[PDB]
Scaffold this active site. Structure first.
Site, PDB file in Angstrom:
ATOM      1  N   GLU A 165       0.593  -1.404  -5.827  1.00  0.00           N
ATOM      2  CA  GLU A 165       0.137  -1.513  -4.312  1.00  0.00           C
ATOM      3  C   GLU A 165       0.690  -3.027  -4.037  1.00  0.00           C
ATOM      4  O   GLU A 165       1.346  -3.626  -4.791  1.00  0.00           O
ATOM      5  CB  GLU A 165      -1.509  -1.751  -4.797  1.00  0.00           C
ATOM      6  CG  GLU A 165      -2.129  -2.493  -5.734  1.00  0.00           C
ATOM      7  CD  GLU A 165      -3.438  -2.414  -5.890  1.00  0.00           C
ATOM      8  OE1 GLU A 165      -4.148  -3.593  -5.621  1.00  0.00           O
ATOM      9  OE2 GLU A 165      -4.107  -1.499  -6.141  1.00  0.00           O
ATOM     10  N   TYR A 199      -8.367   6.367   1.443  1.00  0.00           N
ATOM     11  CA  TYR A 199      -9.117   5.433   2.371  1.00  0.00           C
ATOM     12  C   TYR A 199      -9.276   5.847   3.893  1.00  0.00           C
ATOM     13  O   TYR A 199      -9.735   5.134   4.623  1.00  0.00           O
ATOM     14  CB  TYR A 199      -8.633   4.039   2.220  1.00  0.00           C
ATOM     15  CG  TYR A 199      -8.318   3.706   0.827  1.00  0.00           C
ATOM     16  CD1 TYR A 199      -9.484   3.012   0.123  1.00  0.00           C
ATOM     17  CD2 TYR A 199      -7.256   3.744  -0.177  1.00  0.00           C
ATOM     18  CE1 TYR A 199      -9.443   2.608  -1.277  1.00  0.00           C
ATOM     19  CE2 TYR A 199      -7.432   3.385  -1.432  1.00  0.00           C
ATOM     20  CZ  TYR A 199      -8.416   2.914  -1.998  1.00  0.00           C
ATOM     21  OH  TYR A 199      -8.673   2.421  -3.358  1.00  0.00           O
ATOM     22  N   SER A 222      -3.107   5.723  -0.502  1.00  0.00           N
ATOM     23  CA  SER A 222      -3.597   5.117   0.723  1.00  0.00           C
ATOM     24  C   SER A 222      -4.506   6.237   1.456  1.00  0.00           C
ATOM     25  O   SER A 222      -5.548   6.075   2.047  1.00  0.00           O
ATOM     26  CB  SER A 222      -2.492   4.641   1.361  1.00  0.00           C
ATOM     27  OG  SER A 222      -2.069   3.563   0.983  1.00  0.00           O
TER      28      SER A 222
HETATM   29  N1  LIG Z   1      -6.303   0.982   2.605  1.00  0.00           N
HETATM   30  C1  LIG Z   1      -5.113   1.075   2.241  1.00  0.00           C
HETATM   31  O1  LIG Z   1      -4.094   1.449   2.720  1.00  0.00           O
HETATM   32  C2  LIG Z   1      -4.870   0.699   0.786  1.00  0.00           C
HETATM   33  C3  LIG Z   1      -3.501   0.725   0.296  1.00  0.00           C
HETATM   34  C4  LIG Z   1      -3.331   0.273  -1.227  1.00  0.00           C
HETATM   35  C5  LIG Z   1      -4.567  -0.312  -1.997  1.00  0.00           C
HETATM   36  C6  LIG Z   1      -5.821  -0.024  -1.394  1.00  0.00           C
HETATM   37  C7  LIG Z   1      -7.009  -0.520  -2.462  1.00  0.00           C
HETATM   38  O2  LIG Z   1      -8.208  -0.343  -1.699  1.00  0.00           O
HETATM   39  C8  LIG Z   1      -8.914  -1.482  -1.811  1.00  0.00           C
HETATM   40  C9  LIG Z   1      -9.654  -2.131  -0.728  1.00  0.00           C
HETATM   41  O3  LIG Z   1      -8.705  -1.993   0.443  1.00  0.00           O
HETATM   42  P1  LIG Z   1      -9.502  -1.625   1.946  1.00  0.00           P
HETATM   43  O4  LIG Z   1      -8.522  -0.578   2.590  1.00  0.00           O
HETATM   44  O5  LIG Z   1     -10.771  -1.303   1.918  1.00  0.00           O
HETATM   45  O6  LIG Z   1      -9.180  -3.139   2.646  1.00  0.00           O
HETATM   46  P2  LIG Z   1     -10.191  -4.410   2.908  1.00  0.00           P
HETATM   47  O7  LIG Z   1      -9.397  -5.725   3.226  1.00  0.00           O
HETATM   48  O8  LIG Z   1     -11.129  -4.284   1.672  1.00  0.00           O
HETATM   49  O9  LIG Z   1     -10.718  -3.838   4.087  1.00  0.00           O
HETATM   50  C10 LIG Z   1     -10.480  -3.897   5.521  1.00  0.00           C
HETATM   51  C11 LIG Z   1     -10.476  -2.933   6.208  1.00  0.00           C
HETATM   52  O10 LIG Z   1     -10.222  -3.346   7.962  1.00  0.00           O
HETATM   53  C12 LIG Z   1      -9.348  -2.561   8.374  1.00  0.00           C
HETATM   54  N2  LIG Z   1      -9.007  -3.291   9.525  1.00  0.00           N
HETATM   55  C13 LIG Z   1      -7.968  -4.328   9.771  1.00  0.00           C
HETATM   56  N3  LIG Z   1      -8.061  -4.705  10.987  1.00  0.00           N
HETATM   57  C14 LIG Z   1      -8.794  -3.945  11.621  1.00  0.00           C
HETATM   58  C15 LIG Z   1      -9.243  -4.132  12.820  1.00  0.00           C
HETATM   59  N4  LIG Z   1      -8.617  -4.745  13.966  1.00  0.00           N
HETATM   60  N5  LIG Z   1     -10.209  -3.149  13.454  1.00  0.00           N
HETATM   61  C16 LIG Z   1     -10.869  -2.415  12.547  1.00  0.00           C
HETATM   62  N6  LIG Z   1     -10.307  -2.388  11.001  1.00  0.00           N
HETATM   63  C17 LIG Z   1      -9.644  -3.195  10.853  1.00  0.00           C
HETATM   64  C18 LIG Z   1      -8.106  -2.505   7.375  1.00  0.00           C
HETATM   65  O11 LIG Z   1      -7.367  -1.356   7.722  1.00  0.00           O
HETATM   66  C19 LIG Z   1      -9.126  -2.078   6.107  1.00  0.00           C
HETATM   67  O12 LIG Z   1      -9.637  -0.770   6.192  1.00  0.00           O
HETATM   68  C20 LIG Z   1      -7.861  -2.695  -2.497  1.00  0.00           C
HETATM   69  O13 LIG Z   1      -8.330  -3.578  -3.085  1.00  0.00           O
HETATM   70  C21 LIG Z   1      -6.991  -1.918  -3.062  1.00  0.00           C
HETATM   71  O14 LIG Z   1      -6.987  -1.794  -4.357  1.00  0.00           O
HETATM   72  C22 LIG Z   1      -5.933   0.260  -0.067  1.00  0.00           C
HETATM   73  N1  LIG Z   2      -9.367  -5.095 -12.621  1.00  0.00           N
HETATM   74  C1  LIG Z   2      -9.471  -4.893 -11.331  1.00  0.00           C
HETATM   75  N2  LIG Z   2      -9.942  -5.475 -10.616  1.00  0.00           N
HETATM   76  C2  LIG Z   2     -10.183  -5.181  -9.152  1.00  0.00           C
HETATM   77  N3  LIG Z   2      -9.571  -4.078  -8.660  1.00  0.00           N
HETATM   78  C3  LIG Z   2      -9.175  -3.226  -9.708  1.00  0.00           C
HETATM   79  C4  LIG Z   2      -9.033  -3.375 -11.105  1.00  0.00           C
HETATM   80  N4  LIG Z   2      -8.309  -2.209 -11.642  1.00  0.00           N
HETATM   81  C5  LIG Z   2      -8.361  -1.503 -10.683  1.00  0.00           C
HETATM   82  N5  LIG Z   2      -8.631  -2.088  -9.368  1.00  0.00           N
HETATM   83  C6  LIG Z   2      -8.575  -1.345  -8.245  1.00  0.00           C
HETATM   84  O1  LIG Z   2      -9.167   0.103  -8.260  1.00  0.00           O
HETATM   85  C7  LIG Z   2      -8.134   1.163  -7.889  1.00  0.00           C
HETATM   86  C8  LIG Z   2      -7.339   1.491  -8.954  1.00  0.00           C
HETATM   87  O2  LIG Z   2      -5.927   1.484  -8.656  1.00  0.00           O
HETATM   88  P1  LIG Z   2      -4.893   2.691  -9.104  1.00  0.00           P
HETATM   89  O3  LIG Z   2      -4.684   2.226 -10.615  1.00  0.00           O
HETATM   90  O4  LIG Z   2      -3.536   2.602  -8.217  1.00  0.00           O
HETATM   91  O5  LIG Z   2      -5.655   3.719  -8.822  1.00  0.00           O
HETATM   92  P2  LIG Z   2      -6.161   4.765  -7.455  1.00  0.00           P
HETATM   93  O6  LIG Z   2      -4.894   5.383  -6.788  1.00  0.00           O
HETATM   94  O7  LIG Z   2      -6.948   3.735  -6.561  1.00  0.00           O
HETATM   95  O8  LIG Z   2      -7.025   5.835  -7.828  1.00  0.00           O
HETATM   96  C9  LIG Z   2      -8.070   5.435  -9.077  1.00  0.00           C
HETATM   97  C10 LIG Z   2      -9.370   4.971  -8.441  1.00  0.00           C
HETATM   98  O9  LIG Z   2     -10.149   6.253  -7.892  1.00  0.00           O
HETATM   99  C11 LIG Z   2     -11.221   6.367  -8.659  1.00  0.00           C
HETATM  100  O10 LIG Z   2     -10.857   7.247  -9.775  1.00  0.00           O
HETATM  101  C12 LIG Z   2     -11.682   5.087  -9.111  1.00  0.00           C
HETATM  102  O11 LIG Z   2     -12.548   4.536  -8.586  1.00  0.00           O
HETATM  103  C13 LIG Z   2     -10.403   4.513  -8.985  1.00  0.00           C
HETATM  104  O12 LIG Z   2     -10.656   3.068  -8.370  1.00  0.00           O
HETATM  105  C14 LIG Z   2      -7.615   0.159  -6.616  1.00  0.00           C
HETATM  106  O13 LIG Z   2      -8.395   0.124  -5.747  1.00  0.00           O
HETATM  107  C15 LIG Z   2      -7.227  -1.002  -7.486  1.00  0.00           C
HETATM  108  O14 LIG Z   2      -7.105  -2.197  -6.622  1.00  0.00           O
END
Ligand SMILES: NC(=O)c1cccc([C@@H]2O[C@H](COP(=O)(O)OP(=O)(O)OC[C@H]3O[C@@H](n4cnc5c(N)ncnc54)[C@H](O)[C@@H]3O)[C@@H](O)[C@H]2O)c1
Ligand SMILES: Nc1ncnc2c1ncn2[C@@H]1O[C@H](COP(=O)(O)OP(=O)(O)OC[C@H]2O[C@@H](O)[C@H](O)[C@@H]2O)[C@@H](O)[C@H]1O
Length: 238
Positions: free
Chosen positions: A216, A135, A132
């Site tokens: 996740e 991000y 997390s």
């Molecule tokens: N970001 C994580 O903590 C996280 C945890 C586990 C796994 C992952 C992994 O990253 C992938 C991408 O996730 P991403 O965090 O970009 O979320 P995504 O849905 O694409 O983007 C929405 C963003 O909008 C923020 N937001 C929500 N409310 C508001 C609000 N009121 N004002 C402003 N910003 C707001 C929210 O926090 C997030 O950053 C996902 O596919 C997954 O594989 C992330």
């Molecule tokens: N088939 C898939 N389709 C969509 N998203 C996917 C897929 N496989 C993996 N992902 C996404 O790629 C990331 C991989 O998740 P984890 O295996 O838990 O690994 P992470 O901790 O995110 O670290 C590896 C990440 O960092 C970089 O090395 C690379 O870009 C990779 O996404 C997450 O955001 C996950 O949702």
């Protein structure tokens, strides 16, 4: 300002008047004490779940913050009863926390690209801090990052091994869990309040046929999220 010094930093950190800006968050931000039960758990969560992949830096917990968004307790009341609730990480950019604290964690908007999501548009969380934390988007010359701990009403997890373009859940399911290879040891978890905290060290999950490195968690209703803490991390790069 009738506020602790750590809080006032946090105010300026997000924005960029202090007390006017504090109301705009519509969030009661108390600093948790370093010698408390919560802190000793929370900082242990951060220590144990710092993963082997994410070794480009080590973490250090500067300030913890107990948060209480306005009206979020009442909105979460239905899901409070639902079983299987975890305290899970959610890193984000420091810029966004103004909107997050004010409006809660929301779903990504209708326009945003639907191709670039693992398990559709939802709200993502991890049981690994290091996943997390990525991000937060902290750089060498900007190494202080904010990360959420949230009470998430998972319920009956739809446990998948590979990304799926989800829209609707199976009946009975409330969350989706991406099964990862390495997991917080399940038998080393503890319960803080009415919540599971998966603060085990990283071990193999016994799941062979999955693409994910780490677990996740996804929820598709914004009322399943109750924000609890808002840490302040220090990324110590190598
Ligand atoms: N970001 C994580 O903590 C996280 C945890 C586990 C796994 C992952 C992994 O990253 C992938 C991408 O996730 P991403 O965090 O970009 O979320 P995504 O849905 O694409 O983007 C929405 C963003 O909008 C923020 N937001 C929500 N409310 C508001 C609000 N009121 N004002 C402003 N910003 C707001 C929210 O926090 C997030 O950053 C996902 O596919 C997954 O594989 C992330
Ligand atoms: N088939 C898939 N389709 C969509 N998203 C996917 C897929 N496989 C993996 N992902 C996404 O790629 C990331 C991989 O998740 P984890 O295996 O838990 O690994 P992470 O901790 O995110 O670290 C590896 C990440 O960092 C970089 O090395 C690379 O870009 C990779 O996404 C997450 O955001 C996950 O949702």
């Amino acid at each position: 300002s009738k506020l602790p010094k750590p809080v006032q930093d946090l105010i300026k950190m997000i924005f960029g008047p202090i007390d006017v800006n504090y109301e705009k968050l519509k969030t009661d931000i108390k600093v948790v004490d370093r010698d408390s039960e919560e802190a000793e758990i929370i900082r242990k969560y951060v220590k144990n779940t710092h993963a082997t992949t994410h070794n480009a830096y080590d973490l250090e917990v500067i300030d913890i913050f107990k948060i209480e968004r306005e009206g979020e307790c009442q909105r979460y009341k239905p899901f409070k009863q639902l079983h299987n609730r975890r305290l899970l990480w959610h890193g984000s950019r420091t810029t966004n926390f103004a909107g997050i604290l004010s409006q809660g964690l929301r779903i990504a908007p209708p326009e945003a690209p639907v191709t670039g999501y693992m398990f559709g548009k939802g709200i993502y969380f991890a049981d690994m801090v290091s996943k997390s934390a990525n991000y937060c988007h902290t750089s060498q010359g900007d190494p202080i990052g904010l990360i959420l701990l949230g009470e998430v009403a998972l319920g009956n997890m739809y446990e998948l091994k590979h990304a799926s373009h989800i829209s609707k859940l199976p009946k009975g399911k409330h969350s989706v869990k991406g099964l990862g290879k390495t997991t917080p040891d399940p038998s080393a978890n503890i319960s803080l309040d009415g919540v599971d905290v998966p603060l085990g060290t990283g071990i193999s999950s016994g799941v062979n046929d999955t693409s994910l490195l780490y677990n996740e968690y996804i929820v598709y209703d914004i009322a399943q999220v109750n924000l609890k803490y808002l840490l302040k991390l220090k990324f110590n790069f190598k």
